[PDB]
Amino acid sequence: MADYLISGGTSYVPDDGLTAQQLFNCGDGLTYNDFLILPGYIDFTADQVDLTSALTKKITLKTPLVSSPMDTVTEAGMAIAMALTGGIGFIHHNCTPEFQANEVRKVKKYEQGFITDKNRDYPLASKDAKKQLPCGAAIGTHEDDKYRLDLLAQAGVDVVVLDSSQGNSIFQINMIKYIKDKYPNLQVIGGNVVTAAQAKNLIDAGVDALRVGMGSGSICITQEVLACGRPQATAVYKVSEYARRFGVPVIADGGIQNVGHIAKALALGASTVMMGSLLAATTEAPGEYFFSDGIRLKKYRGMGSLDAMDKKIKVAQGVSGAVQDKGSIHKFVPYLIAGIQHSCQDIGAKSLTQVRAMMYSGELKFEKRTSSAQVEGGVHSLHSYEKRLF
Amino acid sequence: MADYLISGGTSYVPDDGLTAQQLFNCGDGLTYNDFLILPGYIDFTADQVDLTSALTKKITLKTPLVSSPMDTVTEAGMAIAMALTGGIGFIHHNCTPEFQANEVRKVKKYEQGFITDKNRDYPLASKDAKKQLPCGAAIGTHEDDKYRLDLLAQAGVDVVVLDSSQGNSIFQINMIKYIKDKYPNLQVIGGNVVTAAQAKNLIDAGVDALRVGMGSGSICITQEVLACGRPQATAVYKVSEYARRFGVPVIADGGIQNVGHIAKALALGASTVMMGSLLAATTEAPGEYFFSDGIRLKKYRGMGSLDAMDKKIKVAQGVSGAVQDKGSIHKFVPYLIAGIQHSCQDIGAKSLTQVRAMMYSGELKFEKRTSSAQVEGGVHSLHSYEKRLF
Amino acid sequence: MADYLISGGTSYVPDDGLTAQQLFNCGDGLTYNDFLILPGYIDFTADQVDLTSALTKKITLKTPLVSSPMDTVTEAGMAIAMALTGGIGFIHHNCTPEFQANEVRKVKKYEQGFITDKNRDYPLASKDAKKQLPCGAAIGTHEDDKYRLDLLAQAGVDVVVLDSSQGNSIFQINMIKYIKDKYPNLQVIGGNVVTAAQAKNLIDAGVDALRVGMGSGSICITQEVLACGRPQATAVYKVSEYARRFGVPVIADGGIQNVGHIAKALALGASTVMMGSLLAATTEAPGEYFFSDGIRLKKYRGMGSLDAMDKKIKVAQGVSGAVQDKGSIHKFVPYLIAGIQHSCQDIGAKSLTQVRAMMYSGELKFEKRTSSAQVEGGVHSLHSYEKRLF
Amino acid sequence: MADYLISGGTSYVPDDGLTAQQLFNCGDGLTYNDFLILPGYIDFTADQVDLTSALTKKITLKTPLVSSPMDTVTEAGMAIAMALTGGIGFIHHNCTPEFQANEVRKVKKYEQGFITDKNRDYPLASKDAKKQLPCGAAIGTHEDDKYRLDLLAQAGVDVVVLDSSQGNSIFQINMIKYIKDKYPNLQVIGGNVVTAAQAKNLIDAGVDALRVGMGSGSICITQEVLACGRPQATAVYKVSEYARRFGVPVIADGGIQNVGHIAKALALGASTVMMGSLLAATTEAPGEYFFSDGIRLKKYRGMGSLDAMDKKIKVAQGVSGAVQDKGSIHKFVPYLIAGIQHSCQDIGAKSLTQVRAMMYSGELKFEKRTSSAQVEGGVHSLHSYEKRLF
Numbered sequence A, B, C, D: 001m002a003d004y005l006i007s008g009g010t011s012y013v014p015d016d017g018l019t020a021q022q023l024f025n026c027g028d029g030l031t032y033n034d035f036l037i038l039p040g041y042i043d044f045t046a047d048q049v050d051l052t053s054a055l056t057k058k059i060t061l062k063t064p065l066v067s068s069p070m071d072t073v074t075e076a077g078m079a080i081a082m083a084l085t086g087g088i089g090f091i092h093h094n095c096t097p098e099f100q101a102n103e104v105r106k107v108k109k110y111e112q113g114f115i116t117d118k119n120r121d122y123p124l125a126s127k128d129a130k131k132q133l134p135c136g137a138a139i140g141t142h143e144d145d146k147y148r149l150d151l152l153a154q155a156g157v158d159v160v161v162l163d164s165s166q167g168n169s170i171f172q173i174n175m176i177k178y179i180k181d182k183y184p185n186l187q188v189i190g191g192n193v194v195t196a197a198q199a200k201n202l203i204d205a206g207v208d209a210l211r212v213g214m215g216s217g218s219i220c221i222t223q224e225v226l227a228c229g230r231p232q233a234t235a236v237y238k239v240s241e242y243a244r245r246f247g248v249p250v251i252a253d254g255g256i257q258n259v260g261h262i263a264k265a266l267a268l269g270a271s272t273v274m275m276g277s278l279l280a281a282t283t284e285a286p287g288e289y290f291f292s293d294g295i296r297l298k299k300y301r302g303m304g305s306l307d308a309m310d311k312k313i314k315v316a317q318g319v320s321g322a323v324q325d326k327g328s329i330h331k332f333v334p335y336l337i338a339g340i341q342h343s344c345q346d347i348g349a350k351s352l353t354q355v356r357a358m359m360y361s362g363e364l365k366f367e368k369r370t371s372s373a374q375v376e377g378g379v380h381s382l383h384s385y386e387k388r389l390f
Ligand SMILES: NC(=O)c1ccc[n+]([C@@H]2O[C@H](COP(=O)([O-])OP(=O)(O)OC[C@H]3O[C@@H](n4cnc5c(N)ncnc54)[C@H](O)[C@@H]3O)[C@@H](O)[C@H]2O)c1
Pocket: A140, A141, A142, A143, A163, A164, A165, A166, A169, A171, A192, A213, A214, A215, A216, A217, A220, A222, A302, A303, A304, A317, A318, C042, C045, C046, C345
């Protein structure tokens, strides 16, 4: 019959909104708050949404959440918490290599299979072949980072991130090739990059994932000091679009402030999301809580801040501050998971993989927001209010 | 793994060419020769291509070919031949109603099941419930056409076409409602229309298919005489795009000169293709062969030509001429079928339904042709040549 | 082989971002904060970046930094400091000609070769043929400015700037020709201009450099009072693009607030950058430090402010205020130098000359910033923070 | 020779910026702060700029300044002051007709020629044939306004303005025709209008000038309450462009905050500028000065405010407030005159007539301003400052 024979199941579906390609073709320099995702069709419940994510070519996580390698964010405690909730943590390298290797060992010795030296309480916990938690580590691109890498490999790190503001450098590519030849099984994350040209240079060197973002971080002043960077949403879309031609996952790094930002980054092509300030002042973050006028808060600083580089003339690229206490990771990360699942349900996708497939196929639709639209989208017209997320 | 998890099976597939929507958004006023279909991916053979087509809401044919209701094209002989090759013929009404009903009866009595008054030699032959060939008939929108319709319904016609140059009229809509209430099972084809506004008016009246085309016919001079019409490719695309919102098939009528034109019309949203000149001077066309300077050819005239309307000032809308002999329908239609199948294979679709699904989804891609491109596409740079299609 | 023969060394390099010409063709009226420079490829260290800059046709400096001719900014002390750090200072003329000539003499007698009447402590110090520091001076376009010019030429000034808000005037052109005929060796800077038409008029008169900017200065209210001016980034790009057709350097004047602004101005085609407020409240700036509620700060006023013109009815074009203490030039200018070098390294250029060559060739790429993008580029999501640049 | 024969005196003059027609074709909905005028060529001094302006077809003023018919702005004192400084005042009608006629008489009896029962202290003072100051008056479009008009005509008013928010009404057109037939010599100003369609309706009725502006006034809330209006700069340009086809002058009404705004309105096609808040809290404004926390200020209210309409259900269209004391008109208006003259000198025109001629010919050029550009154009980067206009 005609109702089937005219177009074969694919029905009318009025065209309304912009595709991602149309949205990011305009060259406006958009970030997360400049656009929304239009809703789709719902025929399933939120709890059925699958958040399985690729961290690298060969490392898969049950959630897309990653803690940033920052000395005020990720040490062994935070890494264990993120592994237990289904993500991963990357241990910072603003320390001695022995200290870093000890932190990696503490992460890797939390759970064991056959000890050669709880699984039910944490179903989403990611594990390697030997029933051990996964762990990540940051290294630089200088000469001593080779010895640091040897210690980390001995400690049993599963993935290393090359920590730099501008990853498209001869130093970074040289260390990528060094690692590829000396530890052929080790997974390497390159970055940070914001353009497809940088991305091509790093993928040709053989990275297993790309870290995307420059200047969007909450503690960053790189854009205003060095005049270099890119709006985060455009950067994530462009680099993910390039990298998926070669099957390279993208980690979206910097500027994430809420669940909506996480969902937008995943919809734009990122496979995982890296969080700094959002996970600072949690119980598992390193450092100690302190009070400033009846407010509980913790230190949070950028790695390019003068205090961070203290332990010639130094050009600071980050600031040092404090953020309000958020509580425990074991209570905060489930809220993020539920929020992402609800966002996926609203846009009509059963999984993050299907979200990205719909985006690349043009089925997922977007819309811009003017300044008035953003104000309307926020809380308005109230004398006073209380905001309780969960 | 990441190779699956990044976008879920849907690979890169570099973007190249225009979608049909993009092509017909430019407002250039394109017809068939102004564009091409870009090739796709082939993983099947040409003979496996399915050409099942919807003529109306409830009438399905094995091929998309229809013979036009013209007194130099379709009588009982042509109708039987087209039914036997898998299409259908529409018997013209430039005759008395008794003559038309007799032609319909001759078509409907060619093959029988249980005669109440070969099926393997012609596998593609379309048949109704009682194993009889299908037949179509044209009627006008004047008062006496009701009596003509009664005679045709008694003769057992399966579908009637309302024959007019401009179908968006109060007369046509009145007769559509008359037919709907008096013969609730009879299928009605409305037209001719070239715009979505006309199409909406006719679909609201309850037609089961639309006949699309005004001024594109080979014998027609309506565009130059009445300044009204539309380029055929744009008309087919626009009207099919509107009509498929309601599950109404479109017959593309006029200006078809070759297999490439048939394939283009089907790719643009038409479900069947109506042919005039292409089927004139076949053996089954009415009239007798005659010679003019060693060339065998037959009369072919437009219904709005003065000779056609002869049997008060008449404004002619068509010319009368002759076309070269093509041979038999039973040998010519298989060539068209094979050509359409090869076109479908080249663009990478298993069926006409899938062709249209790909076009509406944006997977099928198109390209414009300049005048130099069209010349290049034709035969060139030769001293002399012979063109043998089959 | 094909890897070389296909395109000869020039590899793919995916296209991403806008060229400067594309960015400033849109007519949006951009200034510095509306765009960023995308990062390039790094294969050298920051300290290897060469900042040699052309102040005029024949005067070359080792850094691109120039102090503005303002009575709260540049006197002999500031001029000596800027000469010693590799730049130059322009002595203001809101004084008597004898006072100005004495300041020029004090600058020119700081270092000597063969005295006819430290080289290692300051390697970047600019010097003339006779091992003396270079010095600049401002003059007006009125009649007595000829006598002022005679005194300055006797004092041995190396370059004079014609000080005006709108340099495209018959008065300015007359004085330019006067100076060219009377002091054929003296270098003349014309301005201020913001359009290529003004620039053509001044280059035809024979200037050796152009001063670009109108209304962008921190103390300026010309745009709001006289409705005339231009956004600074667009002005710098347009005028530099015109002036380089004739080999005329451009000084970018006004609205510089940080190292990122300096880098952007140099990337847009300027050869040197003139600074007002950024160098006010340094130790070498004229005037005395004073306290307002525990904050140390110095007077800073525009030359078109009523206080400035006090020493008929006067239309003020500038305001008078105070800015916070910055410390010494000998410590602040090295920070600017290091910042510019780091910006050049990030965008992948070995020198300012190569930065501009990449920009004109289209290799350097830019990106716009929405308001949300600018907010994201700034410090955000923090309860409190401290910003220590160096 | 070729230097003349190639193009005949008209030289290259590089193309840079936008014409007014290009600027206002974009449909962005610009007001005064969204654009600047680019500078031109200066070959004359500021005092030589001629500000002669057409108020109506037959009434010419030496300055383009007009005081608004508002009960907190214009009574006899303000009307006399504006006439003496070269402009005109329009006496408000929120009073009895006898009171209004008495104010008109007080204005018309200030200076006399041959008294039927100083002119060198005020050279710019506008005068009629009998050496008397000109005076304007506002009337409504209701029935009793005819009697009010009779009293005003007897008092000797020279021009009447029809006071309404939306002037394109049958009531306004009826009163325009009434006035034209009963007082054939009286000059009538119609409005307020913001579109060319309204302008055509009023010009067809026979107005001698148009009052342009709806919702832009400082005390107005019409746009937010009735959703109707237009950005003032676009409104002035569009309506002036239409009205000059018929030789009808335009008064730009509302939203003027400074000299730059006046200059922009005149450059966009207006012949005179009407001022409300800018002239409120001057000594000559009606009402009494009063103090609020050490600040001297005066009442200023919109005519559509509830207090104004007090003396069944009233929809307020204006608010009531207070503005800071500005001093005397005799000192403030000369500042405006000098500012306008300086703006004309900067853009390179000898007169307002030549400003508009250059604008219509495309020689005058404009530029847009982003939000960052506007911030840059303002005062910035200062700890504190003092702004003394004159
Ligand atoms: N993502 C961001 O936007 C961002 C911005 C600023 C800082 N940061 C963080 O701050 C930290 C440091 O910043 P960075 O990017 O300057 O790190 P970095 O230490 O890589 O850079 C230091 C400098 O040394 C150079 N360098 C690097 N390797 C070298 C080698 N082998 N030989 C010679 N020179 C070499 C670099 O090009 C750079 O000029 C990192 O944690 C980084 O992630 C991040």
